[PDB]
């Protein structure tokens, strides 16, 4: 329900990569689940069980 790029507008490469890595690693504990359809596109953040 929460997108990514619109909160990543005014950021540099380092912090953007760090927060993308955090977004990708937080799913390992099924906290937030993500679904992608187009290879280079935004994904909304829908929390998991």
């Amino acid at each position: 329900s929460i997108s990514l790029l619109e909160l990543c507008r005014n950021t540099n490469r380092k912090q953007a990569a760090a927060k993308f890595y955090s977004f990708l690693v937080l799913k390992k504990q099924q906290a937030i689940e993500l679904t992608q359809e187009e290879p280079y596109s935004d994904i909304i953040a829908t929390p998991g069980p």
């Binding site: 690693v25 390992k28 504990q29 099924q30």
Partner: protein, 314 residues
Amino acid sequence: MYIKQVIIQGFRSYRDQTIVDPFSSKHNVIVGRNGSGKSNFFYAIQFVLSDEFSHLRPEQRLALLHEGTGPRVISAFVEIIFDNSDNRLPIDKEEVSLRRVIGAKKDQYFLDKKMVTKNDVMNLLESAGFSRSNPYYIVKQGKINQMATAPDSQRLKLLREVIQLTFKQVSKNFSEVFQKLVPGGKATLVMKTGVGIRVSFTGKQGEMREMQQLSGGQKSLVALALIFAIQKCDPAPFYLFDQIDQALDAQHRKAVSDMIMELAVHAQFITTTFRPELLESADKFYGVKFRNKVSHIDVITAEMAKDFVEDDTT
């Protein structure tokens, strides 16, 4: 049992006097740069308490002395003095002086400031919990991933040394520590001749498998989980963790740092990491520099290490 003091003089990176402020009670992280002398410090620590350095031909031993400034150093000095406060060592001395002196041909020991031969140390170290037979609890650089996939024969020998009854509760300790490390994991030891390790994570239903097929990061978790299980069942002197978490993610790094903090109270865990995640769980840090072909050791405050490893220092 208690690494109190270490003295190095021309072993492999510190040509001159390198007297160090005595170690912490619980945990010690040694941050530094590349080509500085962190591993050589750990190799010095285990040079007096691990057999497999002096068993080779006098070629690696000859090159094991500092020759970077020209002539080889006459005396390669490494000393660590222990603390038998809990009377774990057979010698009832509050401050036991233990050291190995090596030169061009010398390979001898000094115990409480007297000369002695190598033959006198194995009994006292084994009675103190030191496992000189195997490189247990002294995990080297990048080797944390081979203990997990080791064949069942090696694990059976390890548990036999650690005999026929101190394994059922070791399995329970491994279960509890592994669920502590991984909230969703359900690994368990199984006794067949050999012992298997039914590893699992995030499935919790039927994902029990065999150790070899696990990922390259889960292997480090399994290996250190077995080490910590052996610790919880039976205390061990201390632990040298040289880049114990260079392969696993920061998520487990926090999950191993907090629980090593919960485990540092009983025994000392001297470690080394370039990631800030593991250094939050110590009291007295360290910093190893490399200048003018003579390295140096100096204690650094917490914020100094945090600044050193938080971002690039180029």
